[PDB]
Every structure is written in C-alpha cells, then in structure tokens.
C-alpha cells in the first residue's frame, strides 16, 4: 500500500535522516516501460542542456553535464511517466502534516535527465539555496545492472553538519527522497555510461508563497 509505505517508512526516514531510499518502487515491468518512454524521448533529439538558477555561460557542462527535457505527464507516448508522477503525487500528498512543518501544495514538471557518459556529472550543489519553495527532491532512477566501479555516476549526498555521506547508486526502479535545502549538498560523480533519471521537486505552501512575493 502506498499510504502504509509512506507513513511506516518514508516519513520516519525523512524526519530522522533527511534521506529516504525506496527500492523496487513500481516493479520491473512498469519501470521498463518508463525506460522505453525516456529513451524514445531521447531518440527525438529534444533534450537540451541542464540549466542553472543563475546561469552565466551558455555552455555550463562543467557545472552540470546532463541533458534534460521537461514532462507534464499528459504528453503523447508519456503515459507511463504520467503514471509514475501520479504515484509519487499520491504518496507525497499522503505525507502531508508529517514531513516536519512542510505542507506540500505543488510540484515542478518532471525533469527527465540523461548524463551521456563521457565523464559528465554535476558538481556538489544544493537544490534550494535561497528559499525558492522547493522542500523535497524526488528522483526515480532507470539504469539496470549499474556498476559504479566501471560507470561512476554515484550520487553522493553530504548531509550537513557531520563528516557523513550517503552514496546512492542510480539503480533501476529506485525512488529517492531528500530535503532540497542546504541540509543536503550533493553531487553526481562523473558517469561513464548513459545515466537516466526522472526528478520531481515538491513545494511547501508557505515557503512557496513567500518566494512568490520575493520574485
């Protein structure tokens, strides 16, 4: 059950550690269909360079070297991505009142992202630096039989205040949650194979409105 999973596993893990990993989130068949839709999107050549909040160079691959496309989930041939988004939204909304002080009332479009090997990555960064309203980062990974010792691409999270870190392999059908603010600096270490993932950011109501009056 999605609700039971959320309250029994995700809420405690988030409030204690600020990171939560759920493996085998949708199962092999559905995850495979999502991988097919993502690869078909990639095959159309539509992906564009990942963007930064404050971008200073047209080409910023040394900061983040991924290529992305934004998906609403209602698009043609994207039905299963839409199912993934509906599942995540159902889960998150069922966490409301239990993710600290956050009351989630919105999300971004889904960011489908591809690091095309060749040592591309994402230097250590924070998703939400300045209170832009993003409170929870959700990432769904699509890469089968991923061997970090050969392909790199580990997501290393450096939880604030301690020498600790969490290494997250971008493993197929893995769903990852973490606080988007400065508590969780993280980096994608250089990848040497094609690396696919889908990210959704969820917004806190009050921080979102405050960010609205501030921008």
């Amino acid at each position: 059950p999605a609700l039971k999973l959320a309250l029994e596993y995700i809420v405690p893990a988030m409030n204690k550690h600020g990171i939560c990993v759920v493996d085998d989130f949708l199962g092999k068949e559905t995850g495979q269909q999502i991988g097919d839709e993502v690869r078909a999107l990639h095959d159309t050549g539509k992906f564009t360079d990942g963007q930064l909040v404050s971008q200073k160079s047209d080409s910023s691959k040394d900061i983040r070297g991924d290529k992305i496309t934004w998906i609403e989930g209602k698009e043609p041939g994207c039905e299963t991505i839409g199912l993934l988004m509906s599942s995540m939204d159902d889960l998150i909304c069922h966490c409301n009142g239990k993710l600290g002080s956050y009351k989630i009332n919105g999300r971004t479009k889904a960011m489908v992202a591809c690091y095309p090997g060749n040592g591309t990555g994402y230097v250590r960064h924070v998703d939400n630096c300045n209170g832009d309203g993003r409170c929870v980062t959700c990432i769904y990974y699509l890469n089968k039989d991923w061997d970090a010792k050969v392909s790199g691409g580990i997501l290393r999270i450096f939880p604030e205040g301690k020498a600790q870190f969490a290494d997250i392999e971008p493993k197929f059908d893995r769903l990852l949650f973490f606080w988007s603010d400065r508590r969780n600096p993280h980096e994608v270490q250089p990848a040497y194979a094609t690396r696919y993932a889908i990210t959704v950011w969820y917004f806190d109501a009050d921080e979102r409105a405050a960010a609205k009056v501030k921008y």
Binding site: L52, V53, N96, G106, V123, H125, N128
Partner: peptide
C-alpha cells in the same frame, strides 16, 4: 552568494497538488 550558480533550474511552471 554563489549558491544559485550551481543550483538546478526549477522550470517556469508549478503544478498545484494536495489541497
């Protein structure tokens, strides 16, 4: 500061959820 030089763009759209 330099934090937003490294942060991922959120897109131009927010989709309402939950309530």
């Amino acid at each position: 500061d330099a934090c937003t030089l490294l942060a991922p763009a959120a897109g131009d759209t927010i989709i309402s959820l939950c309530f």
